[PDB]
Design a protein around this ligand. Structure first.
Ligand SMILES: CC(C)=CCN1Cc2cc(Cl)cc3[nH]c(=S)n(c23)C[C@@H]1C
Ligand SMILES: [Mg+2]
Lengths: 525, 412
């Protein structure tokens, strides 16, 4: 038997005392039968009038079958049960798995009832099966094992299974076992016969504790279509994605398409969705039809072709280095691929996360490095050596001059156009011979010139970007610009090369054409 | 699993235990953690827990100073914040104002001293922690403490007595030495020449071994506050004057006696930036007075035991950093500078960690409390690399921020 896990109710609460719904004789007859079965099996045992707690039960028929099932409504008891460590949503990613000669999945089979329930807690699982004639039986029961559908069941069952498997695991340190729901995955590099035997051995080890497992004649064989994936002994991939051939596309359709499209990203490089996302602008209803533009059409056609190609990922080989390579697919878009062996990945991906309203490729590429770093540590436990399209000098220039602290692991420059660069750099010292503009929506120069323009609907801070812009447009190749807007100063000082604000983008364009620019700040009153 | 008497500890009223997430660990760290945790399990220090304990506290592996040995570090920060305060009356522990004046102070990690005292059976669940697994391939090894844990605030309090008894002899045999405890750390100050100092340090060591109790060497005396400085130059241009004004216009919020009048008058007219402007007599004397005013920290800054200690750090470049410790805005208790040390390796993160640590030691030595840092770095980055260079046994509360371009220009 297994060691009982002590359960407690949430502090300051009493057990469930909820009424049982009136039942149909037909069903009562079914319940009495099922409950007796469970009592003979010791799963449950009748109680005395001592117990005031109760939980509703009802009979259900099996889907597309003709027979009775017993369902207990543990909602209430669950609200009152303490929290457990429970199952974290942390699941293994296919690219983290290694190659195996043979893998099998043993379907545990309701081991919930195979595991005992803390005696002290047992009373809280009380339920009642009403009598057929008014004043009569009305059998009262309580659980002796883990109730199907109870709060602690999934957690306690998993903990129990782990203990039960500790030994078998120490005995065979060449066999990986992974638990998931009512499934037990066993993988191994044993030649087929040896494996097949070891599996039968594991089954017996479960049977000793009551975990009735399935025979090799009805077990699930690879691939393992698990969570949108298709698991194989040596390779992996995602469940085949089929793109619709619609004439009319609803916003809902377009939205689902982008979702399926994004999913593919992790393995299919080249998947693009920008054009498709644009169809969502100004949409008034999920049922609204948006015709497709020539660019969206071209993008859909391209992804369709990309998907007609059954690419697959490869498992991790602990003996070889991890290599991450990053590229610029578009403005703001970066594509990466992690491989151990020359140009054939374990996983791929995209990075479009724009942090802040303005940025530059150098800053953005850096942030992609950090995402991959976190992701690699999570999946493979170590960071990959990166191959980036930026030269050392370029990175060091930006780095040492930026106010924030940054650090890139270990990388190598890869001359693969486009090479990321800084399109412009502000002067560290005011330009001699250059004209000086004193902005405020209007500027005045040392040379006498001046323009006062009219701005409508402008925000306080945007008016400040405008003046700078103005000075920028009317000046020569070399300019000195004095401003009082610490805001505008901040932005332009950041050396952005892309922004959400078109005004900033224009200023940026102006900045690129100049030979020399010095921006200075001063309080103005 | 426990001996002697266990002192009952409780979380603050109504407070529940911590359920903090574990930041992803590197395979090497995990391995180090598994090796270390198994020995602690055998020694009965910790025990595997079941799914009926929902709590969690983050753990990490750091590297001991000049030693190929890892040290499990447990981020008990949240738990400590939820742990009851500890008594009143005659608490022989406060803080030696004298410790900061000493010539040499050594730090000793007397953390293992806790491992000899059991933790109240009931509080044990709250100290829960989890060794993570590569790619979630396995549930994760869960443990809790049976003994006073390192890094928890309750530990020094509960061991306080056992500690004083042990130190009373050395304390009365060498009163020319100042010893102050902070968490797992022990501060040993003295004015003896470096030679006699290290000797005495070593002697305290074996004296601790004597009772089962098994690196860093400061010089608090030489700590000096960094004042606000103004560019002194041969000839001044419009630009120089413009900057001098912005700076002085800021420092005035601190020292109000700073005037800019004359200097501003030199900035009349849309002249060219590069145009050199000689300073009128009345301006030269204004700048000069401004200089004298900045020669010293602002009068009236007092440490308040009841307020948070905040520390801000700024990237100045080429391995240089500037920090300030204060409680009320602009009212600094201290300001300083930091330049890359220990290795032709240094990158932004390693330096920041060294700096944070450096500033933290000082606060403990000075006020006997760690500060709340405002770090100039992206969270994800910090969380990924901080552990790789950390060596302290305590972990201060930190937050991340976006340093203003102007503040930098006003320091160093
Ligand atoms: C569905 C999940 C999470 C399976 C995890 N699972 C089964 C599996 C399946 C294949 Cl085809 C190759 C695998 N390689 C490895 S490692 N595993 C694995 C780990 C365990 C044994
Ligand atoms: Mg102006």
């Amino acid at each position: 038997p297994i060691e009982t896990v002590p359960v407690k109710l949430k502090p300051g609460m009493d057990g469930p005392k909820v009424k049982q719904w009136p039942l149909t004789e037909e069903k009562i007859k079914a319940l009495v039968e099922i409950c007796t079965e469970m009592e003979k099996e010791g799963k449950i045992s009748k109680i005395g009038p001592e117990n005031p707690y109760n939980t509703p039960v009802f009979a259900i028929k099996k889907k597309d079958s003709t027979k009775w099932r017993k369902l207990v409504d543990f909602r209430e008891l669950n609200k009152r049960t303490q929290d457990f460590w429970e199952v974290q949503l942390g699941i293994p990613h296919p690219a983290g798995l290694k190659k195996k000669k043979s893998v099998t999945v043993l379907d545990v089979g309701d081991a919930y009832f195979s595991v005992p329930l803390d005696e002290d807690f047992r009373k809280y699982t009380a339920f009642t099966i009403p009598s057929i004639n008014n004043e009569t039986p009305g059998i009262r029961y309580q659980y002796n094992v883990l109730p199907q559908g109870w709060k602690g069941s999934p957690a306690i069952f998993q903990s129990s299974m782990t203990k039960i498997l500790e030994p078998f695991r120490k005995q065979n340190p060449d066999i990986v076992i992974y638990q998931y729901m009512d499934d037990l995955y066993v993988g191994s590099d044993l030649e087929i016969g040896q494996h097949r035997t070891k599996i039968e051995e594991l089954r017996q080890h479960l049977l000793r504790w009551g975990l009735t497992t399935p025979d090799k004649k009805h077990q699930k064989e690879p691939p393992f279509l698990w969570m949108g994936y298709e698991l194989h002994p040596d390779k992996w991939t995602v469940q085949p994605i089929v793109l619709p051939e619609k004439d009319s596309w609803t916003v809902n359709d377009i939205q689902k398409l982008v979702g399926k499209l994004n999913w593919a990203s992790q393995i299919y490089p080249g998947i693009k969705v920008r054009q498709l996302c644009k169809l969502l602008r100004g949409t008034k209803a999920l049922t609204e039809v948006i015709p497709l533009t020539e660019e969206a059409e071209l993008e859909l056609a391209e992804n369709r072709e990309i998907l007609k190609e059954p690419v697959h990922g490869v498992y991790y080989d602990p003996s070889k280095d991890l290599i991450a390579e990053i590229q610029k697919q578009g403005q703001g878009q970066w594509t990466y691929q992690i491989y151990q062996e020359p140009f054939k990945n374990l996983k791929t991906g995209k990075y479009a996360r724009m942090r802040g309203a303005h940025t530059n490729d150098v800053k953005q590429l850096t942030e992609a490095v950090q995402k991959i770093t976190t992701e690699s540590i999570v999946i493979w436990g170590k960071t990959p050596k990166f191959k980036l399209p930026i030269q050392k000098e370029t990175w060091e220039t930006w780095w040492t001059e930026y106010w924030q602290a940054t650090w890139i692991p270990e990388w190598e420059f890869v001359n693969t156009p486009p090479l990321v660069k800084l399109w412009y750099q502000l002067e560290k010292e005011p330009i001699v011979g250059a004209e000086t503009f004193y902005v405020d929506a209007g500027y005045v120069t040392n040379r006498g010139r001046q323009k006062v323009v009219t701005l409508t609907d402008t925000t306080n801070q945007k008016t400040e970007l405008q003046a700078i812009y103005l000075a920028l447009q009317d000046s020569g190749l070399e300019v000195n610009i004095v401003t009082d807007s610490q805001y505008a100063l901040g932005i332009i000082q950041a050396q952005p090369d892309q922004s959400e604000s078109e005004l900033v983008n224009q200023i940026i364009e102006q900045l690129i054409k100049k030979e020399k620019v010095y921006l200075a700040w001063v309080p103005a009153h | 699993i426990s001996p002697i008497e266990t002192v009952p500890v409780k979380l603050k009223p109504g407070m529940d235990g911590p359920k903090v997430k574990q930041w992803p660990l590197t395979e090497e760290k995990i391995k180090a953690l598994v090796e270390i945790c198994t020995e602690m399990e055998k020694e009965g220090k910790i025990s595997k827990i079941g799914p009926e304990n929902p709590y969690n506290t983050p753990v990490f592996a750091i590297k001991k100073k000049d030693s190929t040995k890892w040290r499990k570090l447990v981020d008990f920060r949240e738990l400590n914040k939820r742990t009851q305060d500890f008594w009143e009356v005659q608490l022989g522990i406060p803080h030696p104002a004298g410790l900061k004046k000493k010539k040499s102070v050594t730090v000793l990690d007397v953390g293992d001293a806790y491992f000899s005292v059991p933790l109240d059976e009931d509080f044990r669940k709250y100290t829960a922690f989890t060794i993570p697994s590569i790619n979630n391939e396995t549930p994760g090894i869960r443990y809790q403490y049976n003994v006073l844990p390192q890094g928890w605030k309750g530990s020094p309090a509960i061991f306080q007595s056992s500690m004083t008894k042990i130190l009373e002899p050395f304390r009365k045999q060498n009163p020319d030495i100042v010893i102050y405890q902070y968490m797992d750390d022990l501060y040993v100050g003295s004015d003896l020449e470096i030679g006699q100092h290290r000797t005495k340090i070593e002697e305290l060591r074996q004296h601790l071994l004597r009772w089962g109790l098994t690196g860093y060497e400061l010089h608090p005396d030489k700590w000096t506050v960094q004042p606000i400085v103004l560019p002194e130059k041969d000839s001044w241009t419009v630009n120089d004057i413009q900057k001098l004004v912005g700076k002085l216009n800021w420092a005035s919020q601190i020292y109000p006696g700073i005037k800019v009048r004359q200097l501003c008058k030199l900035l009349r007219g849309t002249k060219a930036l590069t145009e050199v402007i000689p300073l009128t007599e009345e301006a030269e004397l204004e700048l000069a007075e401004n200089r004298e005013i900045l020669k010293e920290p602002v009068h009236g800054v007092y440490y308040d035991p009841s307020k948070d200690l905040i520390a801000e750090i700024q990237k100045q470049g080429q391995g240089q950093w500037t920090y300030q410790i204060y409680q009320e805005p602009f009212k600094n208790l201290k300001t300083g500078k930091y330049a890359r040390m220990r290795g032709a390796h240094t990158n932004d993160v390693k330096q920041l960690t060294e700096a944070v640590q450096k500033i933290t030691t000082e606060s403990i030595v000075i006020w006997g409390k760690t500060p709340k840092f405002k770090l100039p770095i992206q969270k994800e980055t910090w969380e990924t690399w901080w552990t790789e260079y950390w060596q302290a046994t305590w972990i201060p509360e930190w937050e991340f921020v976006n340093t203003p371009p102007l503040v930098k220009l006003w320091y160093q």
